[PDB]
Amino acid sequence: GVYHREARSGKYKLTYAEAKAVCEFEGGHLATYKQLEAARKIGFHVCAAGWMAKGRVGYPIVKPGPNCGFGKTGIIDYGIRLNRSERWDAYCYNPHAK
């Protein structure tokens, strides 16, 4: 099961190597785009872009709203930003995540 998580305690300020570590520390790892889909089908909408794949960031906005709904509905992924030093969250994943 893929889930969304923030930094050690802060939000919107995670990197690639960081988001990944945070995952393995919370019982899981950086999910993938495909996995994000399967999560979307159940209603997994989080404006907090989660670091996944080689370093792709995105946030599936199903429920529009201030500081969230960008107008459109669906996974908001602009693709790699040529820099995994961005400030986002992390879409962990773990069939147990215990």
UniProtKB/Swiss-Prot annotation:
Q: What does this protein do?
A: Major regulator of extracellular matrix organization during tissue remodeling. Catalyzes the transfer of a heavy chain (HC) from inter-alpha-inhibitor (I-alpha-I) complex to hyaluronan. Cleaves the ester bond between the C-terminus of the HC and GalNAc residue of the chondroitin sulfate chain in I-alpha-I complex followed by transesterification of the HC to hyaluronan. In the process, potentiates the antiprotease function of I-alpha-I complex through release of free bikunin.
User: Where is this chain glycosylated?
Assistant: N83
Cite the Link domain residue spans from the record. 1-94
Top-level taxonomy: Eukaryota, Metazoa, Chordata, Craniata, Vertebrata
Query: Which species expresses this protein natively?
Result: Homo sapiens (Human)
- What domain of life is recorded for the organism? Eukaryota
Swapping Y78F leads to an effect described as:
Abolishes binding to bikunin. Impairs binding of hyaluronan to CD44. Decreases hyaluronan-dependent lymphocyte rolling. Has no effect on transesterification reaction
What upregulates this protein? Answer: Up-regulated in peripheral blood mononuclear cells, high endothelial venules, airway epithelium and submucosal gland in response to inflammatory cytokine TNF. Down-regulated upon differentiation of mesenchymal stem cells to osteoblasts.
Q: Impact of mutating H4K?
A: Decreases binding of hyaluronan to CD44. Decreases hyaluronan-dependent lymphocyte rolling
Complex formation: Interacts (via Link domain) with inter-alpha-inhibitor (I-alpha-I) component bikunin. Interacts with ITIH2/HC2; this interaction is required for transesterification of the HC to hyaluronan. Interacts (via Link and CUB domains) with ITIH1. Chondroitin sulfate may be required for the stability of the complex. Interacts (via Link domain) with various C-X-C and C-C chemokines including PF4, CXCL8, CXCL11, CXCL12, CCL2, CCL7, CCL19, CCL21, and CCL27; this interaction interferes with chemokine binding to glycosaminoglycans.
The record comments on the domains as follows: The Link domain interacts with various extracellular matrix components, including heparin, heparan sulfates, hyaluronan and I-alpha-I complex. It is required for binding to various chemokines.
Q: What is this protein called?
A: Tumor necrosis factor-inducible gene 6 protein
| Portion held of the full protein | 36 to 133 of 277
Cite the effect that the entry attributes to K54A.
Decreases binding to heparin. Has normal binding to bikunin
Spell out the post-translational modification annotation for this entry: N-glycosylated.
* Disulfide topology: C23-C92, C47-C68
Q: In which tissues is it expressed?
A: Expressed in airway epithelium and submucosal gland (at protein level). Colocalizes with bikunin at the ciliary border. Present in bronchoalveolar lavage fluid (at protein level). Expressed in mesenchymal stem cells. Found in the synovial fluid of patients with rheumatoid arthritis.
Annotated compartments: Secreted
